[PDB]
Homo-oligomer: A and B are copies of this chain.
Amino acid sequence: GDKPRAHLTVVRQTPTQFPALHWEHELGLAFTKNRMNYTNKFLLIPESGDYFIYSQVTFRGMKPDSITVVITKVTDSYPEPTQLLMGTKSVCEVGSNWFQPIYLGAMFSLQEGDKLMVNVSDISLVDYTKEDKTFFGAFLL
């Protein structure tokens, strides 16, 4: 039916302690629909329910011991953000022209009013060049 859904895709990040990524939400393959609202680097949840949520962040060098992606839920009532999913990968070679994707997806019970965001260990390692490499989405099941 009309289930809230969104697919967001990476853009060049505007420089600003795991910083949140900000996203493309309507151009190319990105979109939000059915009351799903992308606002202020958050996906804002319109309807309480169980959602499948996912993200891939491709990292590329050009030093760090590891790279990490975390998908986080912020709730109006609760002060502290809740980590939903964490992908952390220690990084192997010196140099270098390495690259690598960290993908995560799972199902969570969310409340109307919740806000989701994706944080990374190092924004300058995020590959922003292409909407098919780094993305973030969620849909009511």
Instruction: Give me the interface of A with B, judged by CB distance under 8 Å.
Output: 3, 5, 7, 29, 31, 50, 52, 54, 56, 58, 66, 70, 82-90, 92-93, 97-109, 130, 132-133, 135, 137, 139, 141
Q: Which of B7, B87, B132, B141 contacts A70 (CB 8 A)?
A: B132
* B5 x A82 contact (CB < 8 A): no
Q: Which of B29, B66, B97, B99 contacts A89 (CB 8 A)?
A: B99
- Kindly provide the distance from the CB of A56 to the nearest chain B CB, expressed in whole angstroms: 7
Pairs A-B, 4 closest by C-beta atoms: A86-B132, A83-B132, A90-B98, A87-B101
Indicate how many identical chains form the complex. 3
- Interface SS of chain A: strand
- Kindly provide the distance from the CB of A63 to the nearest chain B CB, expressed in whole angstroms: 15
Q: Which of B5, B84, B90 contacts A100 (CB 8 A)?
A: B90
Complex Cα distance, B109 from A141, in Å, reads 16
22 contacts between A and B (CB under 8 A): A7-B107, A29-B84, A31-B109, A50-B139, A56-B85, A56-B87, A56-B104, A58-B88, A66-B99, A70-B132, A84-B132, A85-B135, A86-B133, A87-B101, A87-B103, A90-B99, A101-B102, A101-B104, A103-B103, A106-B135, A107-B137, A139-B141
